[PDB]
Amino acid sequence: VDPVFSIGISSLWDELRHMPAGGVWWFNVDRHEDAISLANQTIASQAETAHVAVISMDSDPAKIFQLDDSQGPEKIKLFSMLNHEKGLYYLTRDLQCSIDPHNYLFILVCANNAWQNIPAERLRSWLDKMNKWSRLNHCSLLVINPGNNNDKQFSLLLEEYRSLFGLASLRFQGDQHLLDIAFWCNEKGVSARQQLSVQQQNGIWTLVQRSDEKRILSNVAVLEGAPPLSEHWQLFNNNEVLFNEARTAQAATVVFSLQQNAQIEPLARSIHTLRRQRGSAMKILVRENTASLRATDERLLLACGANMVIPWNAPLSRCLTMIESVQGQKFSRYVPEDITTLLSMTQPLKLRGFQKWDVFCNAVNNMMNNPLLPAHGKGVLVALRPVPGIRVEQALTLCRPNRTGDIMTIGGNRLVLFLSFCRINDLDTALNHIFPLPTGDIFSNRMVWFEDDQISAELVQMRLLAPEQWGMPLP
Amino acid sequence: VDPVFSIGISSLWDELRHMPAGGVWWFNVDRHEDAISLANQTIASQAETAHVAVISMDSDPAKIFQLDDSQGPEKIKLFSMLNHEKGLYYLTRDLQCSIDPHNYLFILVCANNAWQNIPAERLRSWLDKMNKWSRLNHCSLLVINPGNNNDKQFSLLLEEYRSLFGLASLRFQGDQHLLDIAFWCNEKGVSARQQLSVQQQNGIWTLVQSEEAEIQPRSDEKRILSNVAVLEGAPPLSEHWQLFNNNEVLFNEARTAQAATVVFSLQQNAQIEPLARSIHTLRRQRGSAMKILVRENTASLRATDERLLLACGANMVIPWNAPLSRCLTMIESVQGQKFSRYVPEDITTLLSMTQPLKLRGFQKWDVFCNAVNNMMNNPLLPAHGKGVLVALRPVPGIRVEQALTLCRPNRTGDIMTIGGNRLVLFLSFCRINDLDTALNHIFPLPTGDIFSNRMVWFEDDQISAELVQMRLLAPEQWGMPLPLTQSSKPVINAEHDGRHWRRIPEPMRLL
Amino acid sequence: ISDIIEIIVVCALIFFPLGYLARHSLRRIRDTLRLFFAKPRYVKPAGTLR
Amino acid sequence: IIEIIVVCALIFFPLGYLARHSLRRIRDTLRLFFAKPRYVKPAGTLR
Ligand SMILES: Nc1nc2c(ncn2[C@@H]2O[C@@H]3COP(=O)(O)O[C@H]4[C@@H](O)[C@H](n5cnc6c(=O)[nH]c(N)nc65)O[C@@H]4COP(=O)(O)O[C@H]3[C@H]2O)c(=O)[nH]1
Ligand SMILES: Nc1nc2c(ncn2[C@@H]2O[C@@H]3COP(=O)(O)O[C@H]4[C@@H](O)[C@H](n5cnc6c(=O)[nH]c(N)nc65)O[C@@H]4COP(=O)(O)O[C@H]3[C@H]2O)c(=O)[nH]1
Ligand SMILES: Nc1nc2c(ncn2[C@@H]2O[C@@H]3COP(=O)(O)O[C@H]4[C@@H](O)[C@H](n5cnc6c(=O)[nH]c(N)nc65)O[C@@H]4COP(=O)(O)O[C@H]3[C@H]2O)c(=O)[nH]1
Ligand SMILES: Nc1nc2c(ncn2[C@@H]2O[C@@H]3COP(=O)(O)O[C@H]4[C@@H](O)[C@H](n5cnc6c(=O)[nH]c(N)nc65)O[C@@H]4COP(=O)(O)O[C@H]3[C@H]2O)c(=O)[nH]1
DSSP states (O other), X not given: OOOEEEOSOBTOOHHHHEEESSEEEEEEESSHHHHHHHHHHHHHHSOSSOOEEEEESSSOHHHHOOOOSSXXXXXXXXXXXXXXXHHHHHHHHHHHTTOOOSSXXXXXXXXTTGGGSSOHHHHHHHHHHHHHHHHHHTOEEEEEEEOSOOHHHHHHHHHTTTTOSEEEEEEEOSSSEEEEEEEEEETTEEEEEEXXXXXXXXXXXXXXXXXXXXXXXXXXXXXXXXXXXXXXXEEESSHHHHHHHHHHOSSOEEEEEEOSGGGHHHHHHHHHHHHHHSOSSSEEEEEEOSSOOOHHHHXXXXXXXXXXXXXXXSOHHHHHHHHHHTTXXXXXXXXXXXXXXXXXXXXXXXXXXXXXXXXXXXXXXXXXXXXXXXTTOSEEEEEEEEOTTSOHHHHHHTOOOOSTTOEEEEBSSOEEEEEETOOSTTSHHHHHHHOSSOTTSSEEEEEEEOSHHHHHHHHHHHSSSOTTSBOOOOO | OOXXXXXXXXXXXXXXXXXXXXXXXXXXXXXXXXXXXXXXXXXXTSOTTOEEEEEEESSOHHHHOOOOSSSSOSOEEEEEEOSSHHHHHHHHHHHHHHSOOSXXXXXXXXXXXXXXXXXXXXXXXXXXXXXHHXXXXXXXXXXXXXXXXXXXXXXXXXXXXXXXXXXXXXXXXXXXXXXXXXXXXXXXXXXXXXXXXXXEETTEEEEOSOOSSOOOOOTTSSOEEEETTTTTSOOOSSTTEEEESSHHHHHHHHTTOSSOEEEEEEOXXXXXXXXXXXXXXXXXXXXXXXXXXXXXXXXXXXXXXXXXXXXXXXXXXXXXXXXXXXXXXXXXXXXXXXXXXXXXXXXXXXXXXXXXXXXXXXXXXXXXXXXXXXXXTOTTSOTTOSEEEEEEEEOTTSOHHHHHHTXXXXXXXXXXXXXXXXXXXXXXXXXXXXXXXXXXXXXXXXXXXXXXXXXXXOSHHHXXXXXXXXXXXXXXXXXXXXXXHHHSSOSSSEEEOSSOXXXXXXOOOOO | OHHHHHHHHHHHHHHHHHHHHXXXXXXXXXXXXXXXXXXXXXXEEEEXXX | OHHHHHHHHHHHHHHHHHHHHTHHHHXXXXXXXXXXXXXXXXXXXXX
């Protein structure tokens, strides 16, 4: 009786694609443009006779939403709601005023970070009421949400899996998108926790479809003047020949050596190629001999396909035990095909020294909104209050950042610094590197923000500072 | 507050066994005796305080259903109904007549092929009404359906997700039963499309050792459950961090997780074996999606104990040498990884693998050769990492028994013997890279003042060949310890202060 | 004639809320009637098998 | 008199009962007619 609808993903299995006429489905997206594209394709994939409506926060849906000429419904009805939570609260009655909702598909494309301010309890109540209304009217609702940080909200959605008939996510990974289907319920059954890869070609979302295990291939420098432990050890002078011989290997163990910082970039490429051509059976280890690494470079090597990076603090015996640790293990993580999108994450700010208030806030906000950066680990935002007897300009005189991604600003008797990729524990060392005199004889108090939400809130409270309260270095 | 009931299957994951109050679960079973067995085990599997009621047909439930004296609720209330469709319709209000079904568990054990006469639409309406009733009354219903053939009914139930929290089937296949879970939903997520092999051992249903990676929901993939000592007084880095005072509490919290990183802290060697047991339990109960990390804070680990922790199920042991930032990077290095190694059922074997010699000091030639041979014939020890066999030739000034006087092993697995002017010594679980360290610990500090040259064997074939050559030595050339009467005088100017070799200066005349 | 129509209207009026409240509270009426005695038929409690 | 009053009562009782059973229908039709969209305003059927 009640028809089944289809999600806007090409070449998707019937178990994960259909949408019977009763229920609510939720979809998360990383960027607003991707949400709009998915909404347009979902409109385009439907049958000619089906009933479809689109509700968008953005004004003039006639300008941002389109139809397919070849197939799709003859007409779709657009709705616009003001930027108020009361719009979502009244949605059901407001639609009842204008449509009879029997077998009607509602695509709700919210604005960017639209669901960020909705409280947890009211979101739960909204989901429950929408499920009840959908089952009563035999209508289906698809919710498409372009957001940035929804971990708590995603946990809420997972806990409310009874109200939802399906939860999926689309994450941007440079050249391909990752479709994470938490669960999907249809007339063909229930599916649980699939991870799939989807790519956009011409604006269309299409799904992208024992012998030497004990062998150990290692650089000579890994064994600090030590005999080969077993028959299974081959010793190589540099990582180049090691890469060439590992190309042929299948499930062998490869141990690179990091002596110099300049090797990090080519090592990354080597690991990438070795993890692409050769599958998850191979085990890639990077033994760091001299202190020639940052946390960011280690994250890059881990993303490029290294099992783990062994620090230089660990002596040889611990490194050998760690080599024993990775045995029998497969590399389940995803390595993006594009290599430049990984190296671009090494330094995303590219601004040094003093910045005015507005440029500082814009730069830090832009870095915070970057999807291709570690969560809660993008940097540390610090506000320093100078002791009485010295001004913020004098504190700016005694402040010389050394890295590229470190920026400063002065305003409202505060010196506000941002240090990129620095962790909260290693903050005082950084401050000692920056200031000539000890931090403690120059500043009275320290406020620190290092989580994404905290930094965003501090930035939104830092734009409220009216001008003429900002500061510049004295010429 | 509401209870979480459990299905009567042993060794089954919490994902597929918990049944929270407020739902309807459907069970298709092959044989009536199997149905009654499952019903009885499910009755016995509940908490003592749990209120459970059973509904049966065409029999007296007081005679066919049994309660266990060791496990299960103290008392259950039985119900029997005539083999009629009217009973299936009236169930809700008939039960409401007697007891107010708040936080109760109703086991609906039907007659053979009883749901064969119920039409499709009325069955769907019944499922919807039962879902509504269960939600309102905060009670759970477990329908056990004996059926010779319900393929169409199974398909209808497959479409009917919105009225059931779980649909499962149990089919007999000659030697084992296959548990086919179409979908199962509890407080821990949604599982779907799993085929399991179960067997009835001593009348109790159990999972065969095929756990593999079947914990489909990974809702807590970002949660980091760590000991408070792992962060050296640093703030919790993210909201995903939950700190704990000790490993005991952390273990209790982690037994309910799915894919959360669990970071233990090791500070004393006394805490290695129980940590190993806990890790074994966790990896045996919570599958391969979990990330178990052991973080050393002070020097408290050997290579053998690290191997024990790794073989119990831990992904990585972080040395105390690595500072906190490196440790956090190593924590994030293991994200999204599955533990694909094999963890045995018996922890006793793993515990015994940590010390397979248990014999210290001087040995006869026979005892030494046999002990080393038995150590290298144990198929539970790392290859080419069992130990180091070293033969020492003394300097011309000293004999061999005197050199025996000059060696005092400290660890339990270290043995030595004298024969053919050769002091040969086996140090168990010693790598070739750190042989000098061991020799310095068990000899006066400069070893070139007691031995001219040494020969080292650290590979299994090499040590076997050396033992074969040593067994050929004539018994007349074997050595014996010198009696304490003559060994009182130091051979060299050194003395042993319990565990330290101190070198005593002696008078001499310069040239 | 007029008085007849007036009384008819009055009866109509008074009896519309009557059938409105009879349906509105119907579920509660049924619940109470069950509570009092009803007829607990079909499914019959066997006993408390301790 | 009394008889016709009883007849009118009888008429109105199931009449009001059927009117209540269609509460949802009545609300839906009234919402269609009155048409007070407070926050969600249809921008328009697009081709
Ligand atoms: N103690 C300490 N000093 C720090 C740190 N970060 C920056 N510096 C100081 O700042 C100078 C400039 O660093 P940069 O602008 O990032 O420019 C750096 C950077 O681009 C590169 N570099 C050096 N080591 C690494 C490394 O391990 N990783 C990466 N990604 N780049 C590195 O070399 C450039 C020049 O390095 P230097 O000549 O040594 O000079 C460095 C060094 O004196 C730090 O974490 N600790
Ligand atoms: N934003 C920011 N953070 C800073 C700065 N200086 C230090 N940090 C932070 O402090 C951590 C530890 O620095 P370290 O103890 O000097 O220990 C450093 C240092 O010895 C060395 N290193 C890294 N980059 C450079 C470099 O460019 N030059 C030199 N000479 N050493 C470097 O690598 C170690 C590990 O560095 P990381 O893992 O990156 O972790 C660094 C980083 O998070 C700074 O100027 N800006
Ligand atoms: N520097 C150094 N000394 C070594 C080493 N191996 C043994 N010793 C010395 O040998 C003594 C006796 O060790 P044990 O008989 O195995 O008996 C040991 C052992 O059963 C246990 N123990 C201590 N630390 C560890 C450890 O890290 N791992 C394990 N598995 N047991 C330990 O405590 C007992 C007594 O230990 P201690 O009082 O410290 O006394 C130790 C220590 O002084 C080594 O690799 N390095
Ligand atoms: N058979 C034998 N091997 C010996 C002996 N002494 C040293 N070794 C070897 O030398 C390695 C390094 O010992 P370390 O440098 O003193 O460094 C040691 C030491 O600091 C500590 N440790 C281990 N056991 C004990 C112990 O019983 N007591 C104390 N105090 N420390 C210990 O743990 C570190 C790592 O030990 P391992 O991983 O086992 O690795 C040990 C072990 O393979 C010995 O008397 N007998």
